[PDB]
Amino acid sequence: RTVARDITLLECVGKGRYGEVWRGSWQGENVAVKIFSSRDEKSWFRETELYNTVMLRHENILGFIASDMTSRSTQLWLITHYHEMGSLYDYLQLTTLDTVSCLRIVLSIASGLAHLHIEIFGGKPAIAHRDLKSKNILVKKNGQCCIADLGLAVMHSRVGTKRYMAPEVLDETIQVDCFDSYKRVDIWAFGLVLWEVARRMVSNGIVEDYKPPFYDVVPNDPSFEDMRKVVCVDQQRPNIPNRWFSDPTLTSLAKLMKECWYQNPSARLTALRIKKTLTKID
Numbered sequence: 001r002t003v004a005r006d007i008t009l010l011e012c013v014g015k016g017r018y019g020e021v022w023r024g025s026w027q028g029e030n031v032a033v034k035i036f037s038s039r040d041e042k043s044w045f046r047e048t049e050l051y052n053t054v055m056l057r058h059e060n061i062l063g064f065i066a067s068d069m070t071s072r073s074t075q076l077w078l079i080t081h082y083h084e085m086g087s088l089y090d091y092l093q094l095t096t097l098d099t100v101s102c103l104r105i106v107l108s109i110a111s112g113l114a115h116l117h118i119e120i121f122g123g124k125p126a127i128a129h130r131d132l133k134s135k136n137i138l139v140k141k142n143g144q145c146c147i148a149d150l151g152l153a154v155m156h157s158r159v160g161t162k163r164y165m166a167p168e169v170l171d172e173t174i175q176v177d178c179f180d181s182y183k184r185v186d187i188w189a190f191g192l193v194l195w196e197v198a199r200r201m202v203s204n205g206i207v208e209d210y211k212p213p214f215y216d217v218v219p220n221d222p223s224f225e226d227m228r229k230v231v232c233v234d235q236q237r238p239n240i241p242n243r244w245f246s247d248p249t250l251t252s253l254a255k256l257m258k259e260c261w262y263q264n265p266s267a268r269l270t271a272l273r274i275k276k277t278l279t280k281i282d
């Protein structure tokens with residue numbers, strides 16, 4: 001039989017330290033192709049090792065198609081489903097949201113995250129992501145999102161983006177031998193993403209401009225120290241605008257994001273408790 005392996009690379013949709021992402025075509029169908037830099041080979045190995053352990057299949061996890069290693073140097077590609085609307089970060093820049101769309105986005109992210117976190121017997125190991133952020137979430141045409149990039153993921157039976165690092169990562173108190181520690185770092189990051197999205201939800205004719213978390217207190221490409229001073233020493237958290245308190249949905253979302261941002265990691269909500277709270281809003 002013929003094993004059709006040719007992928008036509010059509011346009012670059014992302015470039016960074018990690019390498020490049022391309023829209024490609026296989027047998028007439030769009031795929032996404034991540035071509036890894038030499039600098040970031042261990043991300044390809046860790047994602048490939050994870051998928052060789054458990055073939056994750058979930059509507060809120062970016063869909064795996066293939067890992068390819070080709071002898072040239074060594075060329076490393078990760079092939080996934082393609083989401084033409086791009087990342088949540090991309091989408092929020094010039095889209096505003098209503099209540100239904102905002103809730104659908106954040107509950108879909110919580111659903112993907114709880115699926116990663118939960119151990120299933122007979123199944124999957126528990127998985128922590130370790131680099132959750134709006135650039136690592138894609139928007140689907142149906143209004144739900146999916147979580148991408150398991151290059152830093154850890155399983156239980158490169159470091160994270162500094163802007164999204166939890167206080168225990170910045171002050172190096174994280175209990176590194178404890179898998180629940182890593183889930184709690186993802187919940188912190190989830191709360192920041194929830195803040196990013198909620199800002200873009202309209203209420204009473206008002207909306208905030210897109211900003212990244214901590215835009216008002218750290219520079220672009222903040223240092224580890226910049227972040228530690230804000231999050232650990234001064235214990236700052238993202239601003240909740242007054243206008244949210246006129247809207248029941250944004251009032252409930254503010255409470256939720258507060259319960260993802262406790263200094264004490266074990267006080268933070270779990271992904272499953274966040275889902276339940278989101279299903280009871282509106």
Ligand SMILES: COc1cc(-c2cncc(-c3ccc(C4CCN(C)CC4)cc3)c2C)cc(OC)c1OC
Nearest residue numbers: 001002003004005006007026031065066067068079
């Ligand atoms: C190697 O490389 C790539 C391969 C492919 C690809 C192309 N046609 C057919 C296949 C195929 C799948 C599955 C079987 C099964 C059939 C049942 N039997 C009991 C076991 C074997 C056979 C063939 C594949 C996997 C695509 C690629 O990219 C999208 C590849 O490159 C990464």
Ligand SMILES: COc1cc(-c2cncc(-c3ccc(C4CCN(C)CC4)cc3)c2C)cc(OC)c1OC
Nearest residue numbers: 003004026027029030031064065066067079080081
């Ligand atoms: C990698 O990805 C894609 C792969 C393929 C594809 C191509 N040839 C053959 C297959 C296949 C056939 C049959 C089995 C068997 C397994 C055991 N038992 C006997 C029942 C079923 C498995 C695999 C597939 C899945 C198509 C795709 O898209 C349409 C893929 O997505 C890009």
Ligand SMILES: COc1cc(-c2cncc(-c3ccc(C4CCN(C)CC4)cc3)c2C)cc(OC)c1OC
Nearest residue numbers: 013021032033034078080082083086087136148149
């Ligand atoms: C975060 O991580 C990964 C993401 C992806 C991925 C999957 N679907 C679609 C995309 C995409 C498409 C289109 C745009 C833009 C193009 C310009 N236009 C003006 C707005 C839209 C952006 C993004 C991506 C980047 C694949 C990955 O691996 C293969 C990733 O790595 C795990």
